[PDB]
């Protein structure tokens, strides 16, 4: 009940644009009366079918061969993280075995189990297979709070879909909620901005269109320098109130030395393998 309720609140939020993607649930337990009521409150957008993901007959029943993606939620509060990871690995194996070319989004509790999973022959991270590793992302968010305190809160609030909430009281909560009302989006931007610098289109977009750009599509570039020119046909990683606002970014045309210091890729510092007693 809580897993589906939280998923449907984020998937069907009014701040996204007018998407009409149907949601089909596959589970081997008959839903209780409160889940049946939750599906009745979403009667035109949610369907449930009772079956096992490990059964090719059930996979054909839910028409997984024509689905746009398959999402595999995980039990974050399970007693045995290893057992939960093994079960999720088996589910991924079964889905890929039935249909190798299905986009799979899954939650993985540990990082070694994520490494175990990515060895699957059909597991293609380029095609869109995303293993959202909870321990990895949470420890990365904690580390970014060590570079700038509050950044874990800053990042987490950019994903959850939230409407504007306003109250008459002058309290820190009003300002906080006003800040929380913005999410990170992604869309293609006008030919009227091709040929300009990234700082220039940022100061243009900032309050005239009311849109802030963090990055653009040498592909994924976090906060480009002043020396980079906007390619034709590119997309911007906007932060905005919603998706219907970032449409402006498109719909505008002048409407006014042998030391090994690093890893093999040159992205992390490195040293020789220290003994445990040396660092104790």
């Amino acid at each position: 009940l809580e897993s589906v309720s939280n998923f449907l609140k984020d998937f069907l939020h009014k701040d996204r644009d007018d998407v009409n993607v149907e949601i089909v649930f596959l589970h081997n337990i008959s839903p209780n009366l409160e889940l049946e009521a939750l599906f009745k409150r979403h009667f035109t957008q949610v369907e449930f079918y009772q079956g096992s993901v490990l059964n090719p007959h059930d996979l054909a029943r839910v028409k997984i061969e024509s689905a746009d993606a398959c999402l595999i939620l995980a039990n974050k509060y399970c007693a045995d993280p290893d057992a939960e990871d093994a079960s999720n690995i088996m589910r991924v194996i079964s889905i890929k075995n039935y249909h190798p070319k299905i986009r799979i989004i899954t939650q993985m509790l540990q990082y070694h189990n994520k490494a175990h999973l990515l060895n699957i022959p059909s597991w293609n991270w380029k095609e869109g297979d995303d293993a959202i590793c909870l321990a990895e992302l949470k420890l990365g968010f904690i580390a970014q709070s060590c570079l700038a305190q509050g950044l874990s809160t800053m990042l987490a609030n950019l994903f959850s879909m939230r409407s504007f909430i306003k109250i008459e009281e002058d309290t820190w909560q009003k300002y906080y909620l006003e800040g929380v009302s913005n999410e990170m989006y992604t869309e293609y931007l006008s030919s009227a901005f091709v040929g300009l610098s990234f700082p220039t289109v940022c100061e243009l977009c900032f309050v005239k269109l009311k849109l802030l750009m963090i990055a653009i599509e040498s592909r994924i570039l976090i906060n480009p320098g002043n020396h980079l020119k906007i390619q034709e046909g590119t997309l911007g990683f906007f932060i905005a109130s919603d998706a219907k606002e970032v449409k402006r970014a498109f719909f505008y045309c002048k409407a006014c030395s042998n030391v090994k210091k690093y890893d093999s890729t040159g992205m992390f510092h490195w040293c020789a393998p220290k003994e445990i007693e040396k660092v104790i």
Binding site: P56, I89, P121
Partner: protein
């Protein structure tokens, strides 16, 4: 062995044995697998080398019955470690054999063959300067219904019998459930059990 000596010791036409042992796992009895390879109607130059990859605790809980055989080696690693399987020359073996001891301790009928399936997929998803799909591989499964995950090109159906499944018809999978006809065969013909045994 370890990583260094395994990698520099050239191996080809060998047998690689992948064991998911544990300190609490049951004894597989690897003697019965080694002895047929070690039989004397092969010349000594024709004896395929054997290397075991698995938990060092489980290897030191079974080595007490394998010290009188030649051409054997242990590598104390993980059967799912890509580095170990590359160091063991997995692409040049005459067989890879995948066995699991943790099959009776747990009762889930879903995770019994998870390790074996994952190891098989990891070996089949290897790039060699040829792919890992052409490697000679055999794996032992506890549940016959888990055989559908071994191959991807084949069509899968739970109703289809194990003998009819493609990975078994190719000699890629083996389960102890196919031996149940030996009761009836043995009874009707008393010499069949000794002909098979020899």
């Amino acid at each position: 062995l370890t990583r260094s000596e395994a990698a520099m010791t050239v191996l080809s036409g060998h047998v690689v044995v992948c064991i998911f042992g544990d300190v609490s796992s049951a004894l597989i009895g690897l003697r019965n697998l080694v002895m047929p390879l070690r039989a004397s109607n092969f010349h000594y130059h024709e004896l395929k080398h054997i290397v075991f990859v698995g938990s060092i605790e489980y290897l030191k809980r079974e080595w007490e019955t394998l010290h009188n055989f030649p051409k054997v080696s242990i590598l104390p690693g993980t059967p799912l470690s890509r580095a170990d399987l590359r160091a063991v020359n997995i692409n040049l073996c005459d067989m890879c054999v995948i066995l699991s001891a943790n099959q009776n301790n747990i009762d889930d009928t879903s995770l019994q063959d998870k390790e074996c399936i994952l190891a098989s997929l990891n070996i089949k998803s290897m790039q060699f300067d040829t792919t890992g799909v052409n490697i000679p591989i055999i794996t032992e499964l506890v549940n016959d219904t888990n055989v559908q995950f071994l191959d991807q090109d084949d069509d899968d159906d739970p109703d289809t019998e194990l003998y009819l499944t493609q990975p078994f018809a190719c000699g890629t999978a083996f389960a102890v459930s196919v031996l149940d006809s030996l009761m009836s065969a043995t009874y009707f013909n008393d010499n069949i059990l000794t002909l098979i045994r020899t």
